[PDB]
Amino acid sequence: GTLDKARCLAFVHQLWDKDKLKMFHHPISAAELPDYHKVINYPVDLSTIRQGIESGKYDSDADVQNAVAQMIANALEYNAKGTEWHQQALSFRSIYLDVARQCGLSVDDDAAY
């Protein structure tokens, strides 16, 4: 599986308030970063995720967590180790599962990115 929109939207909102660099808020424009789409095959961002939960494009809580996982992995792949953005992405990788759990989502610890 069921998509819990309340718990998934909460989850997204929490990740929104913790994104101090606003690096996850919006899709990366090719006008700003023309190499981005050459490097990243599956762009995802918290606005698209929000829209996808609202419209029921996501089948389950788990797909929502995977979309957030994809989002973080994109940032860790695209950004250079050491930069503020790579550090914020590393921080996001280490906390997002506890943000999910704090919003009452079930987390498969062994399987999760």
Question: Where do we find the tokens 């953005």?
Answer: 85
Of 3.40.50.10860, 1.20.920.10, 3.20.20.100, 3.40.20.10, the CATH number of 1-113 is 1.20.920.10
Select from 111, 25, 42 the least CA-distant residue to 78.
42
The Cα-based distances of 91 to 26, 34, 39, 40 in angstroms read 19, 26, 22, 20
The Cα-based distances of 85 to 34, 76, 100, 110 in angstroms read 18, 8, 21, 26
The alpha carbon of residue 3 and the mean position of all alpha carbons in its chain are separated, in whole angstroms, by: 16
Amino acid at position 28, single letter: I
Expressed in Å, this structure's resolution amounts to: 2.2
Determination technique for this entry = X-ray
Select from 109, 93, 90 the least CA-distant residue to 101.
109
Select from 76, 63, 60 the least CA-distant residue to 24.
76
The Cα-based distances of 99 to 15, 33, 82, 90 in angstroms read 8, 29, 24, 14
H or E element at residue 14:
helix 5-18
Work out whether the CA dihedral 35, 38, 40, 46 comes out positive or negative. positive
Phi, psi (deg, nearest 5) at residue 72: -70, -45
Amino acid at position 49, single letter: I
